[PDB]
């Protein structure tokens, strides 16, 4: 029982709450996990000695000083009777600026109404931190249950978020209702923001 | 024939342990060896029944192995320990199922050592 | 009558049995040089000496039927000089494989040297004659006697002194001597396999050596449980005059059998105390 | 010390598949076989190791060794798509683990991607997105290489859309299926 950490380079504490020794890994995106900590004090061969591991109950990685490779997920693989049992994983990102989400909002193209399907799409560009909500309000009237949102990793020059939350309904539907609209909420944002356009 | 370790756990670093293996026609050697998690087995200690020694460069002079023929029990004298000498310490030893027999090799269990706290 | 019957039928089994697993286990050894070794030759002796003292089994069981002795006395001469022949070869035989075995462990380093197959073939015809100087005088001495009941075939001396001399040249030089040599050669073999790790440096080598001394002790036990009822049964009749009794001769005929049986019995050792010899032992049965 | 994982492919729901991947440049006896498995965009979940255990996917699954350990799995579900992978440990880990003791999954491989799919190589579906700095992109449904900017993970329909902050070229390789953005 470790989830989302924020700290800059050069930052000094994860913690893995529980009573066998804990193993603490790293694995990058697309890559394959890297033993760092192992029998809850003990460095892997090779590992830098900023990673340190202690144990009271609830054991804690923690790192002198982060570096920019140092950017990854750590897994607590703690043993048991006869089963280990991994964390759910913790992730530190690059702390940067709140930023505030330009939202736009894209009515279905004619070739997909053609076609048979309606897509509606609210885009928040250059956000930060990830954290966000995204409301879909049709006629007035709040909608769940369809839509997918998608989150992007931290971008190289900017260090913020990107996410798009996509409504696909039936072309009769779509043609029911007049007014569409994505309402989003943000800490940056004062009040929620809504785009609106007209069928 | 089983062979039993025992006197591995948690010690500061610079203290002692009292590693132990026993084995219950006749035992001529008994031997140890470590294994870490990122590195291969190395041998530490080598024993005959005559009671002759020896050692690992890093091992030597922080080891004493010694042979109790009575018992048919050896134990290993750890001193000096590091939190470099952290890994799983395996006992070996060789003998004879019986006088007519082949000699053959066995391998113990293995002990847990780490030195941190 | 039915246990006459009965030990004719006994008897004609365990001569047929120990015939054909003689003849076998010769075969065996004869056939292929890896055969060859110093041991297997005692062995070769061994089985040559049960092989010659059954053949003249079915010979000794027929008389059971009608109590005459229709063969030949140059067939009872054969049969009564072989009988003596047995026990002498045999035991020299056991009495040098073990001392063999002493040279192997507790000397290896001359035990190559002095071990050489044509030694071993030297020292079984040692054996031979040692045997012969005491079995040609029995040899000389058979003749048939024209009892006025049936022929039979006995022993001749000129006779209450050479008759237990016989028995006590057997006793001392057949069985004590070879016994205590056999003794003498394992106790210090038994020492030098616990106290020293390794023998021959080989594993498998040395696993081959402890396993082959064991079935040479194995065999030499065999033979002395099989051998002491009749020498000491021989010894005792005669020292205190043992009257005839329905239990004195079925102790006679049991010993006698037992002795002849161990013939047979001795192929069995083999097979089950010697893989070598188990996979012979199928491979040209098929 | 090498681990090379093979053995993954496109399989159907309820079926069965058999993974084994070798293990290279130590000895086997005195060490065991892991499975990992990561589903995507999950963390990392043990199943079992090559003295057997398995996650409570038991008796669903079957693992087996005699240079390699053979991961057998029966009755296949929607969830069990997943990366897999196969780490190093000790033989006796169950008895060496303690409370002062972890040995730890020291060596990993490359992961291998099982995929259970009811469904064939389906042709992608380009839409050009309409500019109401103004945005317009390309979206992909119901399939991917994107060529023109941002562009999203894909997502998966009980699906990734690119943005430009101009022609949209959209490259399926499956399908072999090859595809200007304007107000
Ligand atoms: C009907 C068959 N039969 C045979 C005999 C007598 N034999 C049996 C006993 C013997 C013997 C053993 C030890 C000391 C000794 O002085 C003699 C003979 C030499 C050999 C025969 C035997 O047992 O070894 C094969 C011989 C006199 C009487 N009946």
């Not at chain 1, 690059?94 to 048979?116: E, N, W, Y």
């Not at chain 2, 590693?19 to 024993?47: N, T």
């Not at chain 3, 070794?37 to 040559?48: E, G, H, M, P, R």
């Not at chain 3, 140059?74 to 001392?99: A, Q």
Request: net charge positive; hydrophobic share 40%; charged share 15%.
């Amino acid at each position: 029982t470790q989830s989302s950490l924020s700290a800059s380079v050069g930052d000094r504490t994860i913690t893995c709450r529980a009573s066998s020794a804990v193993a603490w890994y790293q694995q990058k995106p697309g890559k394959a996990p890297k033993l760092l900590i192992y029998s809850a004090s003990s460095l892997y061969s090779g590992v830098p000695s900023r990673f340190s591991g202690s144990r009271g109950t609830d054991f804690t990685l923690t790192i002198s000083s982060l570096q920019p490779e140092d950017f990854a997920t750590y897994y607590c693989q703690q043993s048991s009777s006869s089963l280990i049992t991994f964390g759910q994983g913790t992730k530190v990102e690059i702390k940067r600026t709140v930023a505030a989400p330009s939202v736009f909002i894209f009515p279905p193209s004619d070739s997909q109404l053609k076609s048979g399907t309606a897509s509606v799409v609210c885009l928040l560009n250059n956000f930060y931190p990830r954290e966000a909500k995204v409301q879909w309000k049709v006629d007035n009237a709040l909608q769940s249950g369809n839509s997918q949102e998608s989150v992007t990793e931290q971008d190289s020059k900017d260090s913020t978020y990107s996410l798009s939350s996509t409504l696909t309904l039936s072309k009769a539907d779509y043609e029911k209702h007049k007014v569409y609209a994505c309402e989003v909420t943000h800490q940056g944002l004062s009040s929620p923001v809504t785009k609106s356009f007209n069928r | 024939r089983q062979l039993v370790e025992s006197g591995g756990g948690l010690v500061q670093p610079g203290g002692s342990l009292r590693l132990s293996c026993a084995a219950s026609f006749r035992l001529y050697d008994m031997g140890w060896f470590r294994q870490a998690p990122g590195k291969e087995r190395e041998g530490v200690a080598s024993i005959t029944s005559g009671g002759s020694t020896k050692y690992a460069d890093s091992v030597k002079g922080r080891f004493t192995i010694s042979r109790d023929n009575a018992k048919n029990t050896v134990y290993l004298q750890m001193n000096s320990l590091e939190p470099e000498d952290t890994a799983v310490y395996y006992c070996n030893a060789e003998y004879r199922t019986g006088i007519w027999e082949e000699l053959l090799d066995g391998w113990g269990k293995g002990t847990p050592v780490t030195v941190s706290s | 009558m039915i246990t006459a019957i009965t030990i004719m039928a006994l008897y004609s089994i365990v001569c047929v049995v120990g015939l054909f697993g003689n003849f076998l286990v010769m075969y065996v050894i004869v056939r292929y040089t890896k055969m060859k070794t110093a041991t297997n030759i005692y062995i070769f002796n061994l089985a040559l000496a049960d092989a010659l003292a059954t053949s003249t089994l079915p010979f000794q069981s027929v008389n059971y039927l009608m109590g005459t002795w229709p063969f030949g006395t140059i067939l009872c001469k054969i049969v009564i000089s072989i009988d003596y022949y047995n026990m002498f070869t045999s035991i020299f035989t056991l009495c040098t494989m073990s001392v063999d075995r002493y040279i192997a462990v507790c000397h290896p380093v001359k035990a190559l040297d002095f071990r050489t197959p044509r030694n071993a073939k030297i020292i079984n015809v040692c054996n031979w004659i040692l045997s012969s100087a005491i079995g040609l005088p029995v040899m000389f001495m058979a003749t048939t006697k024209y009892r006025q009941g049936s022929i039979d075939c006995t022993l001749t001396f000129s006779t209450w002194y050479w008759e237990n001399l016989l028995k006590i040249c057997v006793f001392i030089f057949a069985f004590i001597m070879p016994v205590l040599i056999i003794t003498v050669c394992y106790g210090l073999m038994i020492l030098r396999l616990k106290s020293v790790r390794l023998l021959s440096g080989s594993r498998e080598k040395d696993r081959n050596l402890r396993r082959i001394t064991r079935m040479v002790l194995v065999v030499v036990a065999v033979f002395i449980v099989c051998w002491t009822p009749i020498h000491i049964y021989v010894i005792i009749k005669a020292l205190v005059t043992i009257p005839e009794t329905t239990f004195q001769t079925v102790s006679w005929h049991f010993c006698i059998a037992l002795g002849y049986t161990n013939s047979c019995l001795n192929p069995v050792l083999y097979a089950f105390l010697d893989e070598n010899f188990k996979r012979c032992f199928r491979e040209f049965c098929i | 010390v090498q681990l090379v994982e093979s053995g993954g492919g496109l399989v159907q729901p309820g079926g069965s598949l058999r993974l084994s991947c070798a293990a290279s440049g130590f000895n086997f006896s005195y060490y065991s076989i892991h499975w990992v498995r990561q589903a995507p965009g999950k963390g990392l979940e043990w199943v079992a190791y090559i003295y057997t255990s398995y996650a409570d996917v038991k008796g669903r699954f079957t693992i087996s060794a005699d240079n390699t350990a053979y991961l057998q799995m029966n009755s296949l579900r929607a969830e069990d798509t997943a990366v897999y992978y196969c780490a190093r440990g000790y033989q006796y880990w169950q008895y060496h683990a303690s409370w002062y003791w972890n040995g730890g999954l020291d060596y990993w491989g490359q992961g291998t991607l099982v995929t259970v799919s009811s469904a064939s190589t389906k042709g992608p579906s380009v839409f050009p997105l309409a500019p109401s700095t103004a945005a317009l992109g390309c979206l992909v449904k119901d399939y991917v290489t994107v060529s023109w900017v941002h562009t999203f993970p894909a997502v998966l329909q009980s699906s990734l859309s690119s943005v430009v902050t101009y022609i949209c070229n959209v490259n399926h390789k499956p399908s072999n299926t090859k595809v200007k953005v304007e107000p």
